[PDB]
């Protein structure tokens, strides 16, 4: 949902008050990506265990 | 672009192609010669 997928692109383009709105979307998305990855690895770990 | 002789209509605007050059854009924001300077999708000072 952000204006761009590259973090440095938003940092190099938008001001801090405008970049934080778009950077938060990447953080919210990239955080959920790790929460999904870690959730699967934690579950698959129990399977392999 | 800015100091042109005359502008065209709001539907037949004169689209000037700017290519193979360099120029300061942050000074235009702080030139004190324009009414409004607001950039969307990019900061007016960082695009310079």
Curated annotation (Swiss-Prot), chain A:
Impact upon substituting residue 12 to A: In strain: Alpha/B.1.1.7
Reported function: Subunit of the fusion protein that is processed upon entry into the host cell. Mediates fusion of the virion and cellular membranes by functioning as a class I viral fusion protein. Contains a viral fusion peptide that is unmasked after S2 cleavage. This cleavage can occur at the cell membrane by host TMPRSS2 or during endocytosis by host CSTL. In either case, this triggers an extensive and irreversible conformational change that leads to fusion of the viral envelope with the cellular cytoplasmic membrane, releasing viral genomic RNA into the host cell cytoplasm.
The protein, known as: Spike protein S2'
Gene: S
Residue window of the full protein shown: 971 to 1019 of 1273
């Amino acid at each position: 949902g952000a204006i761009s997928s590259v973090l440095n692109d938003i940092l190099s383009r938008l001001d801090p008050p405008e970049a934080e709105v778009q950077i938060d979307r990447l953080i919210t998305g990239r955080l959920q990506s790790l929460q999904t990855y870690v959730t699967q690895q934690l579950i698959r770990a129990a399977e392999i265990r | 672009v800015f100091n042109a002789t005359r502008f065209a209509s709001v539907y037949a605007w004169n689209r000037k192609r700017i290519s193979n050059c360099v120029a300061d854009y942050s000074v235009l924001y702080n030139s004190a010669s324009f009414s409004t300077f607001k950039c969307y999708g990019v900061s007016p000072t960082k695009l310079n």
